[PDB]
Amino acid sequence: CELTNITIAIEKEECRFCISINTTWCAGYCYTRDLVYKDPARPKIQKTCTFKELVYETVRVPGCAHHADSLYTYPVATQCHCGKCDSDSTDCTVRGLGPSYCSFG
Amino acid sequence: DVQDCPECTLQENPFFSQPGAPILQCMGCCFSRAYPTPLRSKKTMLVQKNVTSESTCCVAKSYNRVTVMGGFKVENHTACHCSTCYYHKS
Amino acid sequence: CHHRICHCSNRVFLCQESKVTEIPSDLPRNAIELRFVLTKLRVIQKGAFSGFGDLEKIEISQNDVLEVIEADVFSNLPKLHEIRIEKANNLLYINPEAFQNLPNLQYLLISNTGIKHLPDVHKIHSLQKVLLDIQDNINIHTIERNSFVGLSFESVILWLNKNGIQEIHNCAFNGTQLDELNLSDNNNLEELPNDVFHGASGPVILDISRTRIHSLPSYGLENLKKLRARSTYNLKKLPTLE
Ligand SMILES: *[C@@H]1O[C@H](CO)[C@@H](O[C@@H]2O[C@H](CO)[C@@H](O)[C@H](O)[C@H]2NC(C)=O)[C@H](O)[C@H]1NC(C)=O
Ligand SMILES: *[C@@H]1O[C@H](CO)[C@@H](O)[C@H](O)[C@H]1NC(C)=O
Ligand SMILES: *[C@@H]1O[C@H](CO)[C@@H](O)[C@H](O)[C@H]1NC(C)=O
Ligand SMILES: *[C@@H]1O[C@H](CO)[C@@H](O)[C@H](O)[C@H]1NC(C)=O
Ligand SMILES: *[C@@H]1O[C@H](CO)[C@@H](O)[C@H](O)[C@H]1NC(C)=O
């Protein structure tokens, strides 16, 4: 589990397109076990690959027809770890749509 | 790359194993990852999350519930796989 | 493998970016997993998953216009272990008879939804320990007399985490063996009826973090081993029989 370079897709609804941006996120392996003895008072813990610290950066997004350029703010991992996904800021699923997902094309 | 993290598999539990009759356990490493939530996703959710995480966990695909020594009932795992995590949140 | 709108992969079906308002009838009867993602489904009809004696998981995720779950959608599903309803923005109604006898239900997840009421689980009668994990449903404000009765014949974990719960009624957990209870982040909840745990195996672990609760009922907490509030407790208190 380490910081990796990925390509995320940023999409402009009005313009019916996405632009691709290279950034840095988390991916890799983390250790987990599955208990064989259950103490209802000592439940299990699992860890996932995810950010420990992140920053925001902005990017200019092309316009079209009747819509001028815009700005978009996005998250950038600065440090990963095997931890708990922070459900305040994170959507903890099995599968998302993927970084470079686009409604068009 | 392959820095080291052993693959999810069956192993013997040192604390409940006995010579001639071991009990096995799923432990190891699964793949997971975090990345910016697709704008499209944010539309399916009443509560906005700028980051999305997908994760899988090392768990028992099939098991047997046997009893050992001190009158503890335990699970004897027969198959492992990386599957859904239920205890990794917040 | 393919069908126009859905991929019959290897016993694992995915309806993504759908050409459907209803779940297709012509889905192969021997599926282990059905995933409906980014769909245009408005309703999940009655007996939708009727005839799948091999179904193990149903993922309903990121469905923008899913609004209604009919009666008897989850029934006659002997192998079903996991139901995951995630991210249905406009799902405001689940029919009080949606779930019915799933001897094998281990996991039931409902999150980031618009439902205003907790599911009716009293007909499930699952033979295994169930993890009931209902979260981020900002419109659920109340738990009522007998909400989790009949869910399972054993230890049940209830994560009623992060909704808009403001009121819990007495005997909410009546007839239930409360393994764990999480009522964290329901930050308008400030009282527990002195009869909440009436007729229950009482929480072993109890999570009241980020609520306005400032006291617990006198009985029902006889098995409390852990209390999560502002910090966690165990041998930091011997009166963990409050
Ligand atoms: C408390 O829990 C029990 C179930 O464990 C509720 O059910 C009573 O007992 C049997 C089933 O064990 C039912 O057939 C009856 O319908 C129930 N009796 C009554 C008086 O309702 C019981 O209802 C719950 N108690 C409360 C306060 O509603
Ligand atoms: C990501 O790509 C940049 C070059 O565009 C590179 O400098 C950097 O080392 C890469 N990130 C990592 C952590 O390998
Ligand atoms: C980011 O770098 C990768 C290869 O390192 C490449 O596929 C891609 O073209 C780069 N993105 C941009 C915006 O040029
Ligand atoms: C646990 O199962 C394995 C086979 O999967 C077997 O070799 C072992 O003897 C079993 N142990 C017990 C305690 O029955
Ligand atoms: C998440 O992103 C939105 C823009 O999409 C931004 O305005 C907001 O400040 C971000 N939230 C957090 C927790 O930083």
Side-chain angles (χ1 to χ4, degrees), chain A residues 37-55:
Chain A
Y37 181 81
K38 165 254 201 182
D39 202 339
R42 181 215 195 238
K44 16 218 152 158
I45 259 190
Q46 293 160 314
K47 289 176 187 141
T48 209
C49 190
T50 173
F51 72 106
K52 177 157 215 158
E53 306 285 350
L54 95 193
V55 316

PDB file of all heavy atoms in Angstrom, chain A residues 37-55:
ATOM      1  N   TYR A  37     -11.918 -17.500  16.851  1.00  0.00           N
ATOM      2  CA  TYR A  37     -12.603 -17.380  18.130  1.00  0.00           C
ATOM      3  C   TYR A  37     -13.290 -16.020  18.253  1.00  0.00           C
ATOM      4  O   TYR A  37     -12.684 -14.978  17.996  1.00  0.00           O
ATOM      5  CB  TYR A  37     -11.644 -17.559  19.302  1.00  0.00           C
ATOM      6  CG  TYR A  37     -12.347 -17.453  20.634  1.00  0.00           C
ATOM      7  CD1 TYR A  37     -13.049 -18.546  21.154  1.00  0.00           C
ATOM      8  CD2 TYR A  37     -12.340 -16.257  21.362  1.00  0.00           C
ATOM      9  CE1 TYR A  37     -13.714 -18.462  22.371  1.00  0.00           C
ATOM     10  CE2 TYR A  37     -13.008 -16.155  22.584  1.00  0.00           C
ATOM     11  CZ  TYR A  37     -13.694 -17.266  23.080  1.00  0.00           C
ATOM     12  OH  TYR A  37     -14.361 -17.199  24.286  1.00  0.00           O
ATOM     13  N   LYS A  38     -14.547 -16.048  18.683  1.00  0.00           N
ATOM     14  CA  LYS A  38     -15.348 -14.843  18.824  1.00  0.00           C
ATOM     15  C   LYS A  38     -15.631 -14.499  20.275  1.00  0.00           C
ATOM     16  O   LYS A  38     -16.307 -15.242  20.994  1.00  0.00           O
ATOM     17  CB  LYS A  38     -16.659 -14.976  18.034  1.00  0.00           C
ATOM     18  CG  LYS A  38     -17.727 -13.944  18.373  1.00  0.00           C
ATOM     19  CD  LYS A  38     -18.850 -14.572  19.191  1.00  0.00           C
ATOM     20  CE  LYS A  38     -20.109 -13.743  19.080  1.00  0.00           C
ATOM     21  NZ  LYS A  38     -21.188 -14.329  19.912  1.00  0.00           N
ATOM     22  N   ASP A  39     -15.081 -13.369  20.699  1.00  0.00           N
ATOM     23  CA  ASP A  39     -15.386 -12.771  21.995  1.00  0.00           C
ATOM     24  C   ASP A  39     -16.313 -11.620  21.560  1.00  0.00           C
ATOM     25  O   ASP A  39     -15.830 -10.663  20.944  1.00  0.00           O
ATOM     26  CB  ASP A  39     -14.087 -12.251  22.637  1.00  0.00           C
ATOM     27  CG  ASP A  39     -14.177 -12.108  24.156  1.00  0.00           C
ATOM     28  OD1 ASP A  39     -15.301 -12.019  24.684  1.00  0.00           O
ATOM     29  OD2 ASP A  39     -13.159 -12.059  24.886  1.00  0.00           O
ATOM     30  N   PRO A  40     -17.634 -11.714  21.823  1.00  0.00           N
ATOM     31  CA  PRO A  40     -18.575 -10.669  21.360  1.00  0.00           C
ATOM     32  C   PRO A  40     -18.154  -9.275  21.835  1.00  0.00           C
ATOM     33  O   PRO A  40     -18.605  -8.266  21.288  1.00  0.00           O
ATOM     34  CB  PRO A  40     -19.919 -11.077  21.976  1.00  0.00           C
ATOM     35  CG  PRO A  40     -19.779 -12.512  22.334  1.00  0.00           C
ATOM     36  CD  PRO A  40     -18.318 -12.770  22.598  1.00  0.00           C
ATOM     37  N   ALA A  41     -17.274  -9.250  22.841  1.00  0.00           N
ATOM     38  CA  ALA A  41     -16.725  -8.024  23.426  1.00  0.00           C
ATOM     39  C   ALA A  41     -15.394  -7.564  22.797  1.00  0.00           C
ATOM     40  O   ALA A  41     -14.993  -6.410  22.971  1.00  0.00           O
ATOM     41  CB  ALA A  41     -16.568  -8.199  24.933  1.00  0.00           C
ATOM     42  N   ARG A  42     -14.716  -8.459  22.072  1.00  0.00           N
ATOM     43  CA  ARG A  42     -13.476  -8.117  21.358  1.00  0.00           C
ATOM     44  C   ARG A  42     -13.609  -8.268  19.832  1.00  0.00           C
ATOM     45  O   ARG A  42     -12.740  -8.881  19.202  1.00  0.00           O
ATOM     46  CB  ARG A  42     -12.297  -8.974  21.867  1.00  0.00           C
ATOM     47  CG  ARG A  42     -10.929  -8.697  21.201  1.00  0.00           C
ATOM     48  CD  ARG A  42     -10.077  -9.958  21.054  1.00  0.00           C
ATOM     49  NE  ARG A  42      -8.670  -9.671  20.763  1.00  0.00           N
ATOM     50  CZ  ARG A  42      -8.008 -10.099  19.690  1.00  0.00           C
ATOM     51  NH1 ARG A  42      -8.609 -10.848  18.769  1.00  0.00           N
ATOM     52  NH2 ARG A  42      -6.731  -9.776  19.537  1.00  0.00           N
ATOM     53  N   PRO A  43     -14.677  -7.720  19.227  1.00  0.00           N
ATOM     54  CA  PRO A  43     -14.853  -7.799  17.779  1.00  0.00           C
ATOM     55  C   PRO A  43     -13.651  -7.430  16.910  1.00  0.00           C
ATOM     56  O   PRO A  43     -12.662  -6.806  17.341  1.00  0.00           O
ATOM     57  CB  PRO A  43     -16.040  -6.871  17.516  1.00  0.00           C
ATOM     58  CG  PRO A  43     -16.865  -7.057  18.718  1.00  0.00           C
ATOM     59  CD  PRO A  43     -15.838  -7.047  19.842  1.00  0.00           C
ATOM     60  N   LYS A  44     -13.805  -7.842  15.667  1.00  0.00           N
ATOM     61  CA  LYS A  44     -12.784  -7.809  14.658  1.00  0.00           C
ATOM     62  C   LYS A  44     -12.476  -6.412  14.149  1.00  0.00           C
ATOM     63  O   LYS A  44     -13.263  -5.479  14.311  1.00  0.00           O
ATOM     64  CB  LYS A  44     -13.242  -8.729  13.520  1.00  0.00           C
ATOM     65  CG  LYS A  44     -14.750  -9.052  13.622  1.00  0.00           C
ATOM     66  CD  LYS A  44     -15.047 -10.495  13.234  1.00  0.00           C
ATOM     67  CE  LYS A  44     -16.299 -10.997  13.946  1.00  0.00           C
ATOM     68  NZ  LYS A  44     -16.889 -12.154  13.208  1.00  0.00           N
ATOM     69  N   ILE A  45     -11.300  -6.287  13.550  1.00  0.00           N
ATOM     70  CA  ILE A  45     -10.894  -5.068  12.887  1.00  0.00           C
ATOM     71  C   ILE A  45     -10.204  -5.421  11.573  1.00  0.00           C
ATOM     72  O   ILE A  45      -9.458  -6.392  11.491  1.00  0.00           O
ATOM     73  CB  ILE A  45     -10.017  -4.206  13.815  1.00  0.00           C
ATOM     74  CG1 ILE A  45     -10.876  -3.089  14.414  1.00  0.00           C
ATOM     75  CG2 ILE A  45      -8.831  -3.625  13.073  1.00  0.00           C
ATOM     76  CD1 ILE A  45     -10.092  -2.004  15.165  1.00  0.00           C
ATOM     77  N   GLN A  46     -10.504  -4.647  10.538  1.00  0.00           N
ATOM     78  CA  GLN A  46      -9.935  -4.837   9.218  1.00  0.00           C
ATOM     79  C   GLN A  46      -9.324  -3.517   8.808  1.00  0.00           C
ATOM     80  O   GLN A  46      -9.777  -2.469   9.236  1.00  0.00           O
ATOM     81  CB  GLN A  46     -11.035  -5.234   8.241  1.00  0.00           C
ATOM     82  CG  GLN A  46     -11.648  -6.595   8.513  1.00  0.00           C
ATOM     83  CD  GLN A  46     -13.006  -6.763   7.869  1.00  0.00           C
ATOM     84  OE1 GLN A  46     -13.856  -5.867   7.950  1.00  0.00           O
ATOM     85  NE2 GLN A  46     -13.223  -7.910   7.228  1.00  0.00           N
ATOM     86  N   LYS A  47      -8.277  -3.550   8.005  1.00  0.00           N
ATOM     87  CA  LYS A  47      -7.663  -2.305   7.566  1.00  0.00           C
ATOM     88  C   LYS A  47      -7.620  -2.237   6.060  1.00  0.00           C
ATOM     89  O   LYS A  47      -7.452  -3.240   5.371  1.00  0.00           O
ATOM     90  CB  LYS A  47      -6.253  -2.150   8.122  1.00  0.00           C
ATOM     91  CG  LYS A  47      -6.177  -1.879   9.606  1.00  0.00           C
ATOM     92  CD  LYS A  47      -4.728  -1.849  10.044  1.00  0.00           C
ATOM     93  CE  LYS A  47      -4.613  -1.743  11.553  1.00  0.00           C
ATOM     94  NZ  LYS A  47      -3.476  -2.602  12.050  1.00  0.00           N
ATOM     95  N   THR A  48      -7.760  -1.032   5.545  1.00  0.00           N
ATOM     96  CA  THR A  48      -7.790  -0.852   4.116  1.00  0.00           C
ATOM     97  C   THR A  48      -6.707   0.139   3.712  1.00  0.00           C
ATOM     98  O   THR A  48      -6.195   0.894   4.545  1.00  0.00           O
ATOM     99  CB  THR A  48      -9.224  -0.409   3.653  1.00  0.00           C
ATOM    100  OG1 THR A  48      -9.450  -0.869   2.322  1.00  0.00           O
ATOM    101  CG2 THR A  48      -9.362   1.103   3.531  1.00  0.00           C
ATOM    102  N   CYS A  49      -6.333   0.103   2.440  1.00  0.00           N
ATOM    103  CA  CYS A  49      -5.406   1.079   1.917  1.00  0.00           C
ATOM    104  C   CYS A  49      -6.191   2.346   1.692  1.00  0.00           C
ATOM    105  O   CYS A  49      -7.254   2.305   1.091  1.00  0.00           O
ATOM    106  CB  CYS A  49      -4.816   0.595   0.608  1.00  0.00           C
ATOM    107  SG  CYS A  49      -3.437   1.603   0.039  1.00  0.00           S
ATOM    108  N   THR A  50      -5.682   3.460   2.200  1.00  0.00           N
ATOM    109  CA  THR A  50      -6.339   4.766   2.062  1.00  0.00           C
ATOM    110  C   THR A  50      -5.421   5.882   2.548  1.00  0.00           C
ATOM    111  O   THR A  50      -4.331   5.625   3.071  1.00  0.00           O
ATOM    112  CB  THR A  50      -7.683   4.812   2.836  1.00  0.00           C
ATOM    113  OG1 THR A  50      -8.199   6.143   2.812  1.00  0.00           O
ATOM    114  CG2 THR A  50      -7.468   4.519   4.310  1.00  0.00           C
ATOM    115  N   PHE A  51      -5.865   7.118   2.390  1.00  0.00           N
ATOM    116  CA  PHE A  51      -5.009   8.245   2.711  1.00  0.00           C
ATOM    117  C   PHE A  51      -4.877   8.459   4.205  1.00  0.00           C
ATOM    118  O   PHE A  51      -5.790   8.141   4.951  1.00  0.00           O
ATOM    119  CB  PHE A  51      -5.527   9.522   2.036  1.00  0.00           C
ATOM    120  CG  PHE A  51      -6.784  10.059   2.643  1.00  0.00           C
ATOM    121  CD1 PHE A  51      -6.752  11.187   3.442  1.00  0.00           C
ATOM    122  CD2 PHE A  51      -8.003   9.443   2.410  1.00  0.00           C
ATOM    123  CE1 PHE A  51      -7.913  11.686   4.004  1.00  0.00           C
ATOM    124  CE2 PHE A  51      -9.161   9.943   2.967  1.00  0.00           C
ATOM    125  CZ  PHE A  51      -9.117  11.069   3.761  1.00  0.00           C
ATOM    126  N   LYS A  52      -3.719   8.972   4.619  1.00  0.00           N
ATOM    127  CA  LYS A  52      -3.465   9.406   5.989  1.00  0.00           C
ATOM    128  C   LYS A  52      -3.557  10.926   6.012  1.00  0.00           C
ATOM    129  O   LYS A  52      -4.000  11.512   6.995  1.00  0.00           O
ATOM    130  CB  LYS A  52      -2.079   8.968   6.458  1.00  0.00           C
ATOM    131  CG  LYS A  52      -1.717   9.458   7.861  1.00  0.00           C
ATOM    132  CD  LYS A  52      -0.641   8.582   8.493  1.00  0.00           C
ATOM    133  CE  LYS A  52      -0.843   8.443  10.004  1.00  0.00           C
ATOM    134  NZ  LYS A  52      -0.152   7.212  10.524  1.00  0.00           N
ATOM    135  N   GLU A  53      -3.107  11.547   4.925  1.00  0.00           N
ATOM    136  CA  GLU A  53      -3.179  12.999   4.733  1.00  0.00           C
ATOM    137  C   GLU A  53      -3.383  13.323   3.241  1.00  0.00           C
ATOM    138  O   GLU A  53      -2.862  12.620   2.358  1.00  0.00           O
ATOM    139  CB  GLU A  53      -1.924  13.726   5.281  1.00  0.00           C
ATOM    140  CG  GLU A  53      -1.552  13.457   6.744  1.00  0.00           C
ATOM    141  CD  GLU A  53      -2.452  14.161   7.774  1.00  0.00           C
ATOM    142  OE1 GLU A  53      -3.271  15.038   7.398  1.00  0.00           O
ATOM    143  OE2 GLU A  53      -2.334  13.827   8.981  1.00  0.00           O
ATOM    144  N   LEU A  54      -4.148  14.382   2.976  1.00  0.00           N
ATOM    145  CA  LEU A  54      -4.468  14.789   1.614  1.00  0.00           C
ATOM    146  C   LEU A  54      -4.541  16.313   1.470  1.00  0.00           C
ATOM    147  O   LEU A  54      -4.725  17.024   2.448  1.00  0.00           O
ATOM    148  CB  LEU A  54      -5.768  14.096   1.147  1.00  0.00           C
ATOM    149  CG  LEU A  54      -7.179  14.700   1.225  1.00  0.00           C
ATOM    150  CD1 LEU A  54      -8.206  13.609   0.986  1.00  0.00           C
ATOM    151  CD2 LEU A  54      -7.451  15.346   2.548  1.00  0.00           C
ATOM    152  N   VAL A  55      -4.362  16.815   0.252  1.00  0.00           N
ATOM    153  CA  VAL A  55      -4.478  18.248  -0.011  1.00  0.00           C
ATOM    154  C   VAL A  55      -5.397  18.496  -1.208  1.00  0.00           C
ATOM    155  O   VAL A  55      -5.696  17.577  -1.978  1.00  0.00           O
ATOM    156  CB  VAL A  55      -3.103  18.915  -0.233  1.00  0.00           C
ATOM    157  CG1 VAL A  55      -2.103  18.409   0.799  1.00  0.00           C
ATOM    158  CG2 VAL A  55      -2.591  18.665  -1.637  1.00  0.00           C
TER     159      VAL A  55
END
